[PDB]
Amino acid sequence: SYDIQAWKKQCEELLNLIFQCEDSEPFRQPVDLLEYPDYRDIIDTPMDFATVRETLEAGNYESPMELCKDVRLIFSNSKAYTPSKRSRIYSMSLRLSAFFEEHISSVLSDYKSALRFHKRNT
């Protein structure tokens, strides 16, 4: 399975699954700096799943590792903002993260395998 390009549609389909999860609701759009006027004091780099989908569809990811780093930033930002480990929105974040990690591992493995095959004889 040595298709170097296959990660992109695999990531589009996984973003579609994430958008169907009720747990994605708080993460589908950039945080509004009205309801949370301090947000930028805590969080240096906002990220959300619509920004990730747009960056992918623009042709602005070179690899599924870069997409993975942005998705993990959504979850670390939610960790940085939660008052406790017992919030609705942080709790939703940890379930969505488990689901994402379960599905992205094969995408990453297949991509890195494809790149090693492409360099086998270099």
DSSP secondary structure of 27-74: GSSPPPTTT-TTHHHH-SS---HHHHHHHHHTT--SSHHHHHHHHHHH
Nearer to ligand ZL3, 46 or 63 (CB): 46
Shortest CB 69 distance to ligand ZL3, Å: 18
At its nearest, how many Å lie between ligand ZL3 and the CB of residue 7?
A: 27
Q: Which residues bind ligand ZL3 (CB under 6 A)?
A: 26, 29, 31, 35-36, 78, 81-82, 87, 89-90
Closer CB to ligand ZL3, 98 or 115, in the complex: 98
Residue type, 45: T
Q: In the complex with ligand ZL3, which residue's Cβ is closer, 63 or 70?
A: 70
Question: At closest approach, how far in Å is the CB of 106 from ligand ZL3?
Answer: 27
Q: Which residue is nearest to ligand ZL3 (CB)?
A: 78
How is 67-119 classified by DSSP, letter by letter?
HHHHHHHHHHHHHHH-SSTT-HHHHHHHHHHHHHHHHHHHHHHHHHHHHHHHT
In the complex with ligand ZL3, the residue whose CB is nearer, 10 or 97, is 97
Smallest separation, CB 107 to ligand ZL3 (Å) = 24
